């Protein structure tokens, strides 16, 4: 059976931090999209430039699947033309985006009692990201006049910060697993 491995992305045991978001290329396969959405769970399902029902019409199947974890409050930033710490410094979608954004609450997986400090996000960055740019650097951010030379301190901050997902957080602070499919037509 030559079906596209959409299970390896949506069903991954571990998801990537948003600043180092994962990308999986899916090509040369027959994609069954109708059943993909069918799993009644996805709290967020929004497509741009394409209709989800009419994706089985596309002859080919050559799609990028980007996956990461953010706050519930930050789900709304995964969209064209959005601003904020995630859309500006972590994961930027273009204005002419052709694809779908899929997200679901994962508080039952990505939160620990003492706080799951494995998921990070970029807090400081001088300029916004280009669309689909991936900045994995953790150079000490110079917030002030004097340089840092890799040394932390005042006006010299580590650019990444952790979520610390706890199960007792509200849904805005709870973790959501996001999958972004990028289509080509």
């Amino acid at each position, epitope marked *: 059976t030559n079906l596209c491995p959409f299970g390896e992305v949506f069903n991954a045991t571990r998801f990537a931090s948003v600043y180092a978001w994962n990308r999986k290329r899916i090509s040369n396969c027959v994609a069954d999209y109708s059943v993909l959405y069918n799993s009644a769970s996805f709290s967020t399902f929004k497509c741009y430039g394409v209709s989800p029902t009419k994706l089985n019409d596309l002859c080919f199947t050559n799609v990028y699947a980007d996956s990461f974890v953010i706050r519930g*409050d930050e789900v709304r930033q995964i969209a064209p033309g959005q601003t904020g710490k995630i859309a500006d410094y972590n994961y930027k979608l273009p204005d002419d985006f052709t694809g779908c954004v899929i997200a679901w609450n994962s*508080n*039952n997986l990505d*939160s*620990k*009692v*003492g*706080g799951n400090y494995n998921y990070l996000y970029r807090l400081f960055r001088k300029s916004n990201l280009k669309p689909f740019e991936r900045d994995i650097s953790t150079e000490i951010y110079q917030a002030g006049s004097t340089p840092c030379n890799g040394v932390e301190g005042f006006n010299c901050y580590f650019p990444l910060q952790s979520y610390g997902f*706890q*199960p*007792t*957080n*509200g*849904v*805005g*602070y709870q973790p959501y697993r996001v999958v972004v499919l990028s289509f080509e037509l």
Partner: antibody
Amino acid sequence: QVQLQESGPGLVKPSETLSLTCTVSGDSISSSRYYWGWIRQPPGKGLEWIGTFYYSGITYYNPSLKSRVTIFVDTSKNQFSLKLSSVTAADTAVYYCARPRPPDYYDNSGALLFDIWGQGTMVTVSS
Amino acid sequence: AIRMTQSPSTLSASVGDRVTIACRASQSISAWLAWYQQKPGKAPKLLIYKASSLESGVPSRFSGSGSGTEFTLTINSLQPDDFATYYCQQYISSSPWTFGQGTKVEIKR
């Protein structure tokens, strides 16, 4: 309205395992959408948070109670349990099953408070 | 583990007085503090959450305030039914020693 009710043996011999059960009663409300915990109170003493069950594999246990605490939630029967092994006279207390109040949208807290309680059951550890 | 300190431990007030109970935290817990009322032979009853938000079904005469390390529960117009032991509980982090020692309010008659 959600109602809790403890049930279990009021007498446990030393070094045995305490076992209590709290049954969730409500308007067809599922126990899968809430967290459940246990709180005890020795006679004439304060309140000690034993632990709370959030999801399967994501549970909190009072570290002062070591590794002898286990809490399981049965979502098809709407009831949860408390297991306390290697009991001594220091474990004789009134045990409450409580429900941590669900947090609001923007709540950032590390733990929670308990808004719904059971009636409490008195367990005596004695020979 | 953050330790909570209630003061006083016991108090006695007449009917209609204005009772004040103070709860002190060893370190700042922001505003994640709750107040409980426990009557004899009963389970504790949640009165206040987030230091000041009142629970549904609690009389308006109960009120709470505070932030950081020191908090205050206020009982306006004390009623004879208000005889109970009151606990404050920090929930900034799941840790041992989460409740205070309790304040037992006696009614003066």
